[PDB]
C-alpha cells in the first residue's frame, strides 16, 4: 500500500499542488507538473494500491484558481479506468 | 528496436502503426508489469510502453474535428520510465516531448 496526504489549506498554487503530489507520491525528478504528466505518473509509475486523502479540498480549490478540481479529476479517471485508487475527501 | 524520435516517426509515417517493440500499458500489466518496480524488461524483454490513447489534457497539441492522439515512450531501454514521448494523431501529425509533457515540438 501507499498513501499520499494533501493538506488542502496549505496548498499555495497549482504549481505548489503538483510539487506536493510529487513528494507525496514519490514521483520522478523529471515530473512535468501538469495534467498529462500526472496521468502518466498514475498509470505507469506510481506504486499500487494507492490511497489518496485530500483534506480541506474546497480551500485548495480556491488557492489554485480552480485547478485543484482538474487534478482530482485525473485521479478519478485513472480509478474509473481500473486503477486501484481509494480517494478520501475529508 | 525502433525507439528513437526519428526512428519511430519514420516508422509511424511509413506504416501508420507503431513498431513491434511497443505494447500498451494494459498489455504490459497483463504480462506482469509493475510500474513502481520498473520491471518491464524482466516481464517483456525489449519492449517499450506505447500505443495508449493520449488525452492532451493541457490542450497543447492542436485539436481538429475527428482527430485523436496516442503516445509512446522514446529512448526507453530498461528500468524506470523516462521523460521522453512521441505523440502522434489519427491523421499523422507527430510531436515530441522530452520534458514529461510540459512542451511539445512538431517533428512530422
Swiss-Prot record, chain A:
Pfam families found in the cross-reference section: Barstar (PF01337)
Compartmental location? Cytoplasm
Gene3D superfamilies with a match to the protein in the record: Barstar-like
Q: InterPro entries, alphabetically?
A: Barstar (IPR000468), Barstar-like_sf (IPR035905)
Quick check: keyword Cytoplasm in the entry? yes
**Keywords of this protein's UniProt record, alphabetized?**
Cytoplasm
Q: Which domain of life is it from?
A: Bacteria
The job of this chain, per UniProt, is described as: Inhibitor of the ribonuclease barnase. Forms a one-to-one non-covalent complex.
Q: Which family does it belong to?
A: Belongs to the barstar family.
Under which name does UniProt file this protein? Barstar
UniProt source species: Bacillus amyloliquefaciens (Bacillus velezensis)
UniProtKB/Swiss-Prot annotation, chain B:
Q: Which residues form the active site?
A: 71 (proton acceptor), 100 (proton donor)
Name the Enzyme Commission number(s) assigned to this protein.
3.1.27.-
Q: This protein is called what?
A: Ribonuclease
Give yes or no: UniProt keyword Repeat. no
Give the biotechnological use.
Introduced by genetic manipulation and expressed in male sterile maize and rape by Plant Genetic Systems and in radicchio rosso by Bejo Zaden. Barnase expressed in transgenic plants will specifically destroy the tissue(s) where it is expressed. After cell transformation, protein expression and plant regeneration, the active nuclease destroys the pollen producing organs thus rendering the plant sterile.
Q: Can you tell me which family this protein belongs to?
A: Belongs to the ribonuclease N1/T1 family.
User: What compartments host this protein?
Assistant: Secreted
Transmembrane feature ranges: none
Intact protein stretch covered? 50 to 157 of 157
Q: Name one GO molecular function term.
A: RNA binding
Purpose of the protein: Hydrolyzes phosphodiester bonds in RNA, poly- and oligoribonucleotides resulting in 3'-nucleoside monophosphates via 2',3'-cyclophosphate intermediates.
A single Gene Ontology CC annotation of this entry is: extracellular region
